[PDB]
Amino acid sequence: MTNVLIVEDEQAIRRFLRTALEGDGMRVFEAETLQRGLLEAATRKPDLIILDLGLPDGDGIEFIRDLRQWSAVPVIVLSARSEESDKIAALDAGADDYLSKPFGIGELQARLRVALRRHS
Amino acid sequence: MTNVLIVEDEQAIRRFLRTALEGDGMRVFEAETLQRGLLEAATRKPDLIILDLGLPDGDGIEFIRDLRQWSAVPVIVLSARSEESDKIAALDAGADDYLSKPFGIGELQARLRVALRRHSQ
Ligand code: BEF
Ligand code: BEF
Ligand SMILES: [Mg+2]
Ligand SMILES: [Mg+2]
């Protein structure tokens, strides 16, 4: 199946994304820390990762920088941080796309499709 | 020879981009109509296109639908149409990214970089 990993500390976000994604026909995995995010990324072979930056054990930008040393999987940042400067940093570190919260599930899922067509 | 095509009808935006994109050492080519745009895409062989949507000779979403039949060049739309369905439409048409005006140039440049790195692969 099309595998998606969500790295987000807040269940309400993770339930909401899963539902929408499982509704669109994707298998979904989860992680609620940065550290557990990296392990799941290396074990579940996700085709796409949705990343949150405000995580309790570190900033997700360190996740993107770790990840990109060993993986080229698409990464969409979904975060409360809305500064232009936050977006620039995360894209340059290696994220592929960035949506601030609050967001529209519709826009997400479409950007999800963009990221899944180009790399695969 | 990293080549950007800007297809945008208001001049001020076009030279705002050129000032920005020429500053990182790229080559920039302008088009003010959808027709002269589609054309430049097929001809100048650019590495990316920044695509306006509100054009005099038709809708940018048709620029994409058409393009995707003969080019795979990354497309980033830059348009004032700030609507969710507008974004979904353009993306589903084969746009790679979408930034609404008004916009920060820094973020447009970082998103341009994503499209270069992902398509050189
Ligand atoms: F905590 Be995440 F960056 F919204
Ligand atoms: F005219 Be563009 F869509 F801003
Ligand atoms: Mg968080
Ligand atoms: Mg216009």
Please name the method used to determine this structure: X-ray
Resolution in A: 2.2
Q: Considering the domain B1-121 in this protein, what is its CATH number?
A: 3.40.50.2300
Chain A interface, mutation test: which of B88, B101, B103, most A Cβ atoms within 10 Å?
B88
Q: How far is the CA of A77 from the centre of ligand 2 (A)?
A: 26
| HEC readout, chain B | CCEEEEECCCHHHHHHHHHHHHCCCCEEEEECCCHHHHHHHHHCCCCEEEECCEECCEEHHHHHHHHCCCCCCCEEEEECCCCHHHHHHHHHCCCCEEEECCCCHHHHHHHHHHHHHHHHC
Nearest to B111 among A91, A104, A119 (CB): A91
* Total Cβ atoms within 10 A of residue A12: 8
Atom index in ligand 1 nearest the CA of residue A13 equals 4
Q: How far is the CA of B114 from the centre of ligand 4 (A)?
A: 24
CA–CA distances in Å: residue A29 to residues A15, A91, B6, B48, B92: 11, 23, 39, 34, 25
In chain A, where the domains are located: 1-120
Q: What type of residue is B93?
A: A
Atom index in ligand 1 nearest the CA of residue A60 equals 3
Q: How far is the CA of B66 from the centre of ligand 2 (A)?
A: 18
Q: Give the CATH H-level superfamily of domain A1-120.
A: Response regulator (3.40.50.2300)
Q: Give the dihedral sign, CA A117/A80/B115/A105.
A: positive
Chain B interface, mutation test: which of A91, A99, A117, most B Cβ atoms within 10 Å?
A91
Give the bridge partners for A30, in sequence order: A6
**CB distance B81 to ligand 2 below 6 Å:** yes
